[PDB]
Amino acid sequence: QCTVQVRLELGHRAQLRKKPTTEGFTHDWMVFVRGPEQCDIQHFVEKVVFWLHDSFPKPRRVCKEPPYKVEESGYAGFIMPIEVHFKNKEEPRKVCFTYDLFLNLEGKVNHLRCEKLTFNNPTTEFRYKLLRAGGVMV
Numbered sequence: 001q002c003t004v005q006v007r008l009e010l011g012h013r014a015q016l017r018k019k020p021t022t023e024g025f026t027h028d029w030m031v032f033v034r035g036p037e038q039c040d041i042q043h044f045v046e047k048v049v050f051w052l053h054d055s056f057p058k059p060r061r062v063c064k065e066p067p068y069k070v071e072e073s074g075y076a077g078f079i080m081p082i083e084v085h086f087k088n089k090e091e092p093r094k095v096c097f098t099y100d101l102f103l104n105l106e107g108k109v110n111h112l113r114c115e116k117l118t119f120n121n122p123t124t125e126f127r128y129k130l131l132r133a134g135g136v137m138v
């Protein structure tokens with residue numbers, strides 16, 4: 001009976017371009033998954049999959065190593081599913097967030113969403129990956 005908590009930070013920045021691109025993109029944005037300061041989520045994260053709006057080319061964007069992010073331009077916000085896959089042999093194998101990639105049509109957005117994962121009775125192997133990433137026993 002051991003519990004290990006880890007923290008993920010999901011976020012995005014978005015800025016209204018001074019002048020739109022020749023292709024009518026009004027906004028640059030960047031979305032990411034990371035750990036807090038001094039933690040290393042690559043120890044227990046296999047890959048992060050960002051599911052972009054179906055209008056984007058290759059909207060299944062995968063990062064297998066850090067940084068777990070996508071940098072894009074576009075013209076609108078949307079709801080972006082983000083799957084974080086674990087280096088876990090048992091359940092849960094992954095967690096899915098629905099991320100609100102919203103834009104400020106009149107300027108800049110800099111948003112952070114903090115997600116605390118609780119793993120009950122991880123395998124010895126996966127427990128090792130969580131604590132090495134900076135996870136805490138509860």
Ligand SMILES: Cc1ccc(C(=O)Nc2ccc3nc(CN4CCCCC4)[nH]c3c2)cc1I
Nearest residue numbers: 025053054055056057072073074075076077078
């Ligand atoms: C409700 C909605 C929200 C966002 C988009 C959008 O911005 N789509 C989009 C579609 C294609 C794109 N292509 C780029 C520019 N490239 C993409 C490939 C890598 C280099 C940058 N940005 C793109 C943005 C479309 C809709 I309707």
